[PDB]
């Protein structure tokens, strides 16, 4: 129904940079709080960053803090994440997921319902 497709990842050298793009289809991405989940190869998932619907509340992961910027292209109706100065420990798959309870009278706990397909990034020589 509603998909969250990724694009821009793959292999890179350490020190270099990269940009991940999150494309929303099936609904309007300009008013749904988003946040990224990274999953290294053969491990669980891990939080990356977070954009709000407002655009004024942003919470990053403590390790990618200071770099690895996130944003949304409300013109192109995407989410953008530019990975800058990567190191060897960032190899993982990345998912772009949207928070379910985005109404004003929800009375329901949080849950990332629309999940991303996920694409891999590999950082080495």
């Amino acid at each position: 129904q509603v998909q969250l497709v990724e694009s821009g990842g793959g292999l890179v050298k350490p020190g270099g940079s990269l940009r991940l793009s999150c494309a929303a289809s099936g609904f309007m991405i300009s008013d749904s709080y988003m946040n990224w989940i990274r999953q290294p190869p053969g491990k669980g998932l891990e939080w990356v960053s977070y954009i709000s619907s407002n655009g004024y509340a942003i919470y990053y992961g403590d390790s990618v803090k200071g770099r690895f910027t996130i944003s949304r292209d409300n013109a192109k109706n995407f989410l953008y994440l530019q990975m800058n100065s990567l190191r060897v420990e960032d190899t993982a798959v990345y998912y772009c997921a949207r928070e379910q309870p985005g109404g004003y009278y929800d009375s329901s706990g949080y849950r990332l319902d629309p999940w991303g397909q996920g694409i891999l990034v590999t950082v080495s020589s």
Binding site: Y104, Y105, D106, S107, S108, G109, Y110
Partner: protein
């Protein structure tokens, strides 16, 4: 009977003095079974303001 005729001496006869009426022994109220409530635990329990 003396008090109703307002006279200390009553002559022979039959007199209608007063009335009696069984009192109610209980009080009951019957209303419809309270049903279509309003959404309050929907405004205080909101997850995001």
């Amino acid at each position: 009977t003396k008090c109703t005729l307002k006279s200390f001496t009553v002559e022979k006869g039959i007199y209608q003095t007063s009335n009696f009426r069984v009192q109610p022994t209980e009080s009951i109220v019957r209303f419809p079974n309270i049903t279509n409530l309003c959404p309050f635990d929907e405004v205080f329990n909101a997850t995001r303001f």
